[PDB]
Nucleic acid binder design. Structure first.
Lengths: 72, 90, 144, 246, 107
RNA sequence: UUUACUUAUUCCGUUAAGUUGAGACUCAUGCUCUGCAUGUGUUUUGGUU
RNA sequence: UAACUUCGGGAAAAGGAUUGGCUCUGAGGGCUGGAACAGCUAACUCAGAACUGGAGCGGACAAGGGGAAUCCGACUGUUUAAUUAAAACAAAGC
RNA sequence: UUAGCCGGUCCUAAGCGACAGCUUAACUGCGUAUACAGUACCUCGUUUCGCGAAAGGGAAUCGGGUUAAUAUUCCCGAGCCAGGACGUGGAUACUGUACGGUAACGUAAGUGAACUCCUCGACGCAGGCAGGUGCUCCGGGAAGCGUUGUCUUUGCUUUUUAACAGCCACCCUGGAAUCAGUUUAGCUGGAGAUAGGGUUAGCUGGCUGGUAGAGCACCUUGGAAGGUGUCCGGUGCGCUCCUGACUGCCCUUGAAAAGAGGAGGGAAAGUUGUUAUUUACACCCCUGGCCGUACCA
């Protein structure tokens, strides 16, 4: 449901311990991408347009966090 | 244009009920659909909400009155005579 | 002679300090900001709550304490009153330099708590006048 | 045999009054200490069309004397009475329109409406639209008082009984003709079902005393005694006099 | 072409059973029961509607924060404000006229 | 045969709140400081109690 | 477009003429840059003319017969479920 | 024949059962009369219990998938509500409950007992007018399909986006006659108009999230695996339901109660730390009983 608009909040909501998974969506138009954290009440999501920033961001997610899912 | 000769507001009731009865209605129907002057604000915007009840549209105040005019003439006589009876008592 | 002056009690009619007594301090007719005749009210947001002889003495100290406020109000909103506060607390001394700039308003209020507490209690006027009718007006809550 | 619709009306059932959207029984304020040793300031908050009557009701807001709470009585509105007006009920109130004086305080020639028969009656006489009861004259003491009713008749009444000074509102609402059956129907729908009345001559001789016959006539005197039973008493009951007046 | 059926238990055209034609991700056209339109707080004795404070059905007035259900003033939740000025200008003057007599009543 | 009483009996009203007979609190028409009283006191505004 | 009239009606009174197809012409808006001009552009609605046809054309469907008088009831409304809808009941007015 | 969210259940309407008693041999009939919070100590106290709506009032739910027969009930996903709550991290106060704006009112939060008043719940009909949902319609783009003796840049189908969640009348200045503003219609204005600048209400409006992974339309290899595409605009006294402000009509003036909230009031607590107000400040945690649910109509 809810969005996030900046990288300050997205790093907090991932690290918060009841966050289950991070499904990550990519789509061609060009390569605009979405992260979505399924937390407990809400599904938070964070739009990024540049692919090279989004490749850097996937490293910044923690490994001890469980899942990741991708179309493709 | 004036678009009837005589019957005026009671063209409504058409070609029935009989012309004497229709004329009795005409004269007091003409009274009740009138605006009257408000006592309290001044503006001539008083309308009859229900029989015996009148509302000043601009003012917002409601007041009691006649069925079909704001001030029945019998009631105007009592407002005179009670003002007199209060004065002589002192 | 304008009714509003630098030493006159009012009642505020509009805004969240409505029906709250307070003293005018200084008057204007516009600036670059504000295209209207405003004035610096220095009033009483919570009046001191009423008191018994048969309370304990520490509770009487607390109940008399005042929450002031400071505000530029428009002239239309304030209402003048018969009474006037010029010969008792001296309202120029009561900070001209500090207003909105520097956000010293908080600093300004703590000035008024010292004054309005010492005025309400021991409110007898110097030399002659025993109670003063002006000052005992401000103590009362304007009960609507 | 068969019971006449005169007789069926007391039985209740389908001839009961249609009370549902009527807005409370209209009364004066119940006789207090405050009303009889001084006065009590009312404020008129609302003026209401009560259905099934010509008069308006004023809704009036008094302060209670004993508790903190705020009471609300509904009177029948004397005309010349507005929303925002102070009414003053009680013994030592001024003789002006609105106010509720005892009758002994009112100087004779006064128009009064909504008058109490007894003391503390709450107000029986002269309540219909346009009507009033005029004061004629007092006793020597001020104990009892003469009144002239909207009928004509003259009534001795206790002076500590009270009423509103002035005429009841909705004045002169019979001077129009209802042109339509529809306008008669809408009148009697919010009262009891008394309408439309069938003529008893149209009925058969079962259903009414007049009905029957190969011509449509009454056949015995329309005039009937006071002493006659339930179901004889139809037509002109106990009549002193008949025919056109003068 | 496509025509629809009531989804709730009430299959009649009352106030409560007001409905709103939507189309879905199915490309399927379908009702939703939107309720009655809430009256926003007309408040006395003027009976004007109050600014600051939204039309909701009165149980959902619980959900909102306390901030949202009022106006920050004296008599803010239920007053016209303009009406409020009347209250103060009464209670200022009706005390002052009452006080002026009681100093004159010393003689 | 007429007209006094009130407790039987009857009817109405109240959220069973101020009844009966004495008394003073204020000013007031005003006389004498204190007197019998005749007397009233919230009525100026859609506040508050 | 009449008698009559409670002046509201009668009245679609009565009595006449036209209508298809095709090809045109005229009148009726909106939005942009500052004497009114210059650009871009969107409705189905009226009026008129020419031509053409086995004189047809509201081409099927749909859709008042009219007028002159008398009796009763004023009018709308109601009624004998399964032989009677009226001139009977009701009605406002008195 | 699978439910916290669809209904019953809860509330009261017309009315109906019983209490106190009152009638009658009882059967019955009447029934608003009555002594019905801070172990111990006070101070308040007027209404009597219940039944009565599967079309009135009312806590909260939507998308796609699924079976031989059930689905807002199963599954996948996304939420919301009632009751009760731990925890970490923020606000506020600590001689006493936050601030800002001239105001209308505002923001991540911003204590409020007894008692009282108010709002919502809460309401007619007709008329046109404006705006919106859905439907119907016209044109361009991309797919597949149809017709083809003749003509036809052609005719037809698909091109969708849920609840939920975030963001996009009134005040100030001012002072009106040579009256001005204004609707289709009238109305509005020194009890302050036009105008300039604000504040607020809103819908089924716009943008993003939900959300393409789904749904839909096609194409190619297996003998069920993998792909592309789902785009961009108009039009109206149109038809539908809804909202909004108006105008008129009445000897017709168009329910109640449960329940939710506001305000006036200032009772209580709190002394710079295990405090105490926040249980809807943000996030986190727990539980949701009973009955109907097939099918015809």
């Amino acid at each position: 449901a809810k969005e996030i608009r900046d990288l300050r909040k997205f790093l907090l909501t991932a690290r918060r311990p009841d966050a289950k998974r991070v499904t990550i969506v990519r789509q061609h138009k060009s390569t605009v991408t979405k992260f979505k954290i399924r937390c407990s009440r809400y599904l938070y999501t964070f739009v990024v347009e540049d692919r090279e920033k989004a490749q850097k961001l996937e490293g910044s997610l923690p490994p001890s966090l469980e899942k990741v899912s991708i179309p493709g | 244009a004036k678009r009837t000769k005589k019957v005026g507001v009671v063209g409504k009731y058409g070609t029935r009920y009989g012309a004497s009865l229709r004329k009795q209605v005409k004269k007091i129907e003409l009274q009740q659909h009138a605006k009257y002057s408000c006592p309290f604000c001044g503006k001539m915007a008083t309308k009859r909400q229900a029989v015996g009840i009148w509302k000043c549209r601009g003012c917002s105040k409601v007041m009691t009155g006649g069925a079909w005019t704001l001030q029945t003439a019998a009631a105007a006589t009592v407002r005179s005579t009670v003002a007199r009876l209060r004065k002589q008592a002192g | 002679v304008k009714l509003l002056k630098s030493g006159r009690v009012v009642v505020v009619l509009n805004g969240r300090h409505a029906g709250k007594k307070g003293v005018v301090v200084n008057t204007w007719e516009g600036s670059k900001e504000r295209q209207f005749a405003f004035c610096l009210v220095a009033g009483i947001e919570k009046a001191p709550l009423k008191v018994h002889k048969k309370m304990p003495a520490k509770k009487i100290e607390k109940r008399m304490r005042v929450k002031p406020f400071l505000k530029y109000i428009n002239v239309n909103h304030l209402m003048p009153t018969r009474y006037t506060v010029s010969s008792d607390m001296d309202v120029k001394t009561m900070p001209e330099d500090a207003m909105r700039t520097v956000d010293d308003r908080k600093a300004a209020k703590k000035g008024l708590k010292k004054i309005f507490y010492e005025k309400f209690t021991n409110p007898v006027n110097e030399k002659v006048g025993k109670v003063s009718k002006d000052l005992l007006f401000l103590r009362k809550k304007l009960r609507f | 045999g068969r019971v006449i619709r005169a007789q069926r009306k007391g039985r209740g059932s389908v001839f009961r009054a249609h009370t549902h959207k009527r807005k409370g029984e209209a009364k004066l304020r119940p006789l207090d200490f405050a009303e009889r040793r001084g006065y009590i300031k009312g404020l008129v908050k609302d003026i209401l069309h009560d259905p099934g009557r010509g008069a308006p009701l004023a809704e009036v807001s008094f302060r209670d004397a004993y508790r903190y709470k705020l009471n609300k009585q509904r009177m029948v509105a004397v005309e010349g009475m507005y929303t925002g007006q102070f009414i003053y009920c009680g013994k030592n109130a001024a003789l002006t329109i609105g106010n509720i004086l005892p009758l002994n305080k009112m100087p004779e020639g006064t128009v009064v409406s909504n008058v109490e028969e007894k003391a503390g009656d709450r107000g029986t006489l002269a309540r219909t639209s346009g009507t009033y009861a005029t004061i004629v004259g007092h006793s020597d003491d001020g104990s009892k008082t003469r009144i002239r009713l909207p009928s004509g008749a003259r009534k001795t009444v206790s002076g500590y009984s009270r009423g509103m000074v002035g005429i009841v509102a909705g004045g002169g609402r019979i001077d129009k003709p209802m042109l339509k059956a529809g306008n008669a129907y809408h009148k009697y729908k919010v009262k009891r079902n008394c309408w439309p009345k069938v003529r008893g001559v149209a009925m058969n001789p079962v259903e009414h005393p007049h009905g029957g016959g190969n011509h449509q006539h009454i056949g015995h005197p329309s005039t009937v005694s006071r002493m006659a039973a339930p179901g004889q008493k139809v037509g002109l009951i106990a009549a002193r006099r008949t025919g056109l007046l003068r | 072409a496509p025509r629809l059926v009531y989804r709730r238990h009430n299959h009649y055209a009352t106030g409560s059973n007001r409905v709103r034609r939507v189309r879905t991700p199915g490309a399927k056209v379908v009702f939703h029961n939107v309720g009655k339109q809430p009256s926003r707080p007309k408040c006395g004795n003027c009976h004007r509607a109050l600014p600051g404070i939204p039309a909701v059905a009165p149980h959902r007035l619980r959900l909102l924060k306390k901030r949202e259900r009022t106006v920050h003033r004296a008599y803010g939740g239920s007053r016209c404000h303009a009406c409020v000025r009347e209250r103060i200008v009464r209670a200022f003057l009706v005390e002052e006229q009452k006080c002026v007599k009681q100093v004159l009543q010393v003689k």
